[PDB]
Design an enzyme around this catalytic site. Structure first.
Site, mmCIF file in Angstrom:
data_model
loop_
_atom_site.group_PDB
_atom_site.id
_atom_site.type_symbol
_atom_site.label_atom_id
_atom_site.label_comp_id
_atom_site.label_asym_id
_atom_site.label_seq_id
_atom_site.Cartn_x
_atom_site.Cartn_y
_atom_site.Cartn_z
ATOM 1 N N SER A 3 -0.308 15.911 -12.229
ATOM 2 C CA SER A 3 -0.156 15.535 -13.578
ATOM 3 C C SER A 3 -0.306 17.029 -14.510
ATOM 4 C CB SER A 3 -1.480 15.137 -13.525
ATOM 5 O OG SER A 3 -1.515 14.369 -15.589
ATOM 6 N N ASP A 21 1.010 -1.132 0.071
ATOM 7 C CA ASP A 21 0.076 0.196 0.468
ATOM 8 C C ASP A 21 0.828 1.233 0.290
ATOM 9 O OD1 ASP A 21 -1.981 1.624 0.502
ATOM 10 O OD2 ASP A 21 -1.934 1.745 2.319
HETATM 11 C C1 LIG Z 1 -10.910 5.631 -1.584
HETATM 12 S S1 LIG Z 1 -9.074 5.424 -0.812
HETATM 13 C C2 LIG Z 1 -10.035 3.634 -0.211
HETATM 14 C C3 LIG Z 1 -9.597 2.498 -0.165
HETATM 15 N N1 LIG Z 1 -9.830 1.113 -0.460
HETATM 16 C C4 LIG Z 1 -10.008 0.294 -1.886
HETATM 17 O O1 LIG Z 1 -9.825 1.057 -2.827
HETATM 18 C C5 LIG Z 1 -10.649 -0.584 -1.716
HETATM 19 C C6 LIG Z 1 -9.171 -1.589 -2.168
HETATM 20 C C7 LIG Z 1 -10.163 -3.046 -1.300
HETATM 21 C C8 LIG Z 1 -9.387 -4.244 -2.293
HETATM 22 C C9 LIG Z 1 -10.510 -5.259 -2.426
HETATM 23 C C10 LIG Z 1 -10.476 -5.649 -1.451
HETATM 24 C C11 LIG Z 1 -10.981 -4.762 0.005
HETATM 25 C C12 LIG Z 1 -10.655 -3.465 -0.478
HETATM 26 N N2 LIG Z 1 -11.370 -1.140 -3.272
HETATM 27 C C13 LIG Z 1 -12.169 -0.732 -3.130
HETATM 28 O O2 LIG Z 1 -13.535 0.347 -2.530
HETATM 29 N N3 LIG Z 1 -13.483 -0.444 -4.181
HETATM 30 C C14 LIG Z 1 -14.811 -0.244 -4.145
HETATM 31 C C15 LIG Z 1 -15.202 -0.171 -5.297
HETATM 32 O O3 LIG Z 1 -14.656 -0.564 -6.720
HETATM 33 C C16 LIG Z 1 -13.604 -0.658 -7.040
HETATM 34 C C17 LIG Z 1 -13.337 -1.144 -5.299
HETATM 35 C C18 LIG Z 1 -7.912 2.755 1.025
HETATM 36 O O4 LIG Z 1 -8.762 2.789 1.710
HETATM 37 N N4 LIG Z 1 -6.997 1.735 1.492
HETATM 38 C C19 LIG Z 1 -5.867 1.917 2.034
HETATM 39 C C20 LIG Z 1 -5.344 0.312 1.935
HETATM 40 C C21 LIG Z 1 -5.466 -1.189 2.754
HETATM 41 C C22 LIG Z 1 -6.564 -1.011 2.955
HETATM 42 C C23 LIG Z 1 -6.682 -2.551 3.932
HETATM 43 C C24 LIG Z 1 -6.924 -3.598 2.932
HETATM 44 C C25 LIG Z 1 -5.683 -3.838 2.874
HETATM 45 C C26 LIG Z 1 -5.498 -2.526 1.539
HETATM 46 C C27 LIG Z 1 -5.008 2.649 1.751
HETATM 47 O O5 LIG Z 1 -4.483 2.572 0.356
HETATM 48 C C28 LIG Z 1 -5.594 3.884 1.601
HETATM 49 O O6 LIG Z 1 -6.394 4.928 2.735
HETATM 50 O O7 LIG Z 1 -5.536 5.044 0.936
HETATM 51 C C29 LIG Z 1 -5.987 6.793 1.250
HETATM 52 C C30 LIG Z 1 -4.725 7.525 1.349
HETATM 53 C C31 LIG Z 1 -7.181 7.627 0.104
#
Ligand SMILES: CSC[C@H](NC(=O)[C@H](Cc1ccccc1)NC(=O)N1CCOCC1)C(=O)N[C@@H](CC1CCCCC1)[C@@H](O)C(=O)OC(C)C
Length: 330
Positions: A199, A35
């Site tokens: 960008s 991440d």
């Molecule tokens: C708008 S920011 C939202 C982002 N989450 C995501 O982007 C998750 C990722 C995921 C994939 C597979 C299974 C479970 C979760 N996917 C997601 O919300 N999706 C929603 C819409 O359809 C596409 C998939 C994020 O919060 N992720 C964390 C990393 C961590 C979380 C726990 C699981 C392992 C990954 C991090 O990147 C983060 O907070 O970024 C902040 C700075 C915005």
């Protein structure tokens, strides 16, 4: 020293990538979500409350000869999609792709929220933003990359994420077979603790490039591409059955449609996302509508170049004292 490891998508929609990481002696292998949008390496463990564990592989510090408890240190994080976990802290040997750091803080979850228990494929997170966002208190812990910088042959790592396919994270060298053309570097601001950059503009399909500054983060742990509302609406205006769906939570379009590509500027360079990479997939299995991979960042409050964008490019996180970000086409 160098390392290289395969990262694999966890499902057929490339929702997230996991990578094998060896924690402990002898080595316990856990598949972690690398991440760049946070800075905690934490794992499910023999500490985690039992009813909140399944699917996952846990780390058991009591079976590792090199694990030390970091006395007194606790951590608590939450992510942008609202998930969260907390616990305590050990140091122990951690290796990725042959590259070994001793003394790395491995955060042991005592509790995890409901989306982590429900996701059997991801056993923890390995955070690669800057160490100022780390959550351990009283003293914050360095990320894997900060701790390997001493021994790396150069202080870089690269992400080469595949479209429905595996890809590669490398540390410590740039694989000049893995991309075409030259890499273009742009400055990173570390103000907020992210790999944050600007960008120089965007185009839709075969239409004109508009020079307008889009400040955003490169974040391997976010699925989609989240950009300013007026930019994302110019995109989907070119797709005749696309509309914003409140129920679903974004732009939806008929799955039969051929989508236009999306180009974003890096410096003088341009990165083109194929339209097929923006078709995220059907809203449910066997539906005729599909969800779009470019969506608005207005409710998020920052622009996110997530996996939809970074998988169309070979990207270099340059961790020199002045960091930069490199993109090349591939
Ligand atoms: C708008 S920011 C939202 C982002 N989450 C995501 O982007 C998750 C990722 C995921 C994939 C597979 C299974 C479970 C979760 N996917 C997601 O919300 N999706 C929603 C819409 O359809 C596409 C998939 C994020 O919060 N992720 C964390 C990393 C961590 C979380 C726990 C699981 C392992 C990954 C991090 O990147 C983060 O907070 O970024 C902040 C700075 C915005």
């Amino acid at each position: 020293s160098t390392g290289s490891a395969t990262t694999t998508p966890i499902d057929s929609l490339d929702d997230a990538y996991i990578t094998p990481v060896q924690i402990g002696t002898p080595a316990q292998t856990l598949n972690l979500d690398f991440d760049t949008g946070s800075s905690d390496l934490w794992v499910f463990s023999s500490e985690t409350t039992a009813s909140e564990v399944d699917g996952q592989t846990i780390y058991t510090p009591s079976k590792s000869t090199t694990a030390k408890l970091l006395s007194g240190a606790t951590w608590s994080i939450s992510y942008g999609d609202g998930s969260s976990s907390s616990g305590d802290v050990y140091t122990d040997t951690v290796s990725v792709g042959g590259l070994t750091v001793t003394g790395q803080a491995v955060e042991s979850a005592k509790k995890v929220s409901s989306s982590f228990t429900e996701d059997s494929t991801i056993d923890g997170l390995l955070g690669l933003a800057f160490s100022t966002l780390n959550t351990v208190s009283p003293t914050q812990q360095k990320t894997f990359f900060d701790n390997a910088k001493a021994s790396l042959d150069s202080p870089v790592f690269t992400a080469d994420l595949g479209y429905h396919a595996p890809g590669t994270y490398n540390f410590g060298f740039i694989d000049t077979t893995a991309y075409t053309g030259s890499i273009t570097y742009t400055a990173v601001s570390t103000k907020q603790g992210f790999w944050e950059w600007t960008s120089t503009g965007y185009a839709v399909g075969s239409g004109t490039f508009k020079s307008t500054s889009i400040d955003g983060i490169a974040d391997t742990g976010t699925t989609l591409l989240y950009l300013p509302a007026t930019v994302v609406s110019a995109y989907w205006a070119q797709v005749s059955g696309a509309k914003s769906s409140s129920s679903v939570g974004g732009y939806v379009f008929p799955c039969s449609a051929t989508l236009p590509s999306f180009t974003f500027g890096v410096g003088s360079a341009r990165i083109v996302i194929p339209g097929d990479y923006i078709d995220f997939g059907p809203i449910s299995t066997g539906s005729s509508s599909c969800f779009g991979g470019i969506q608005s960042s207005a409710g998020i409050g920052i622009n996110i170049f997530g996996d939809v964008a970074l998988k169309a490019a070979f990207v270099v996180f340059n961790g020199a004292t002045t960091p930069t970000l490199g993109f090349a086409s591939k």
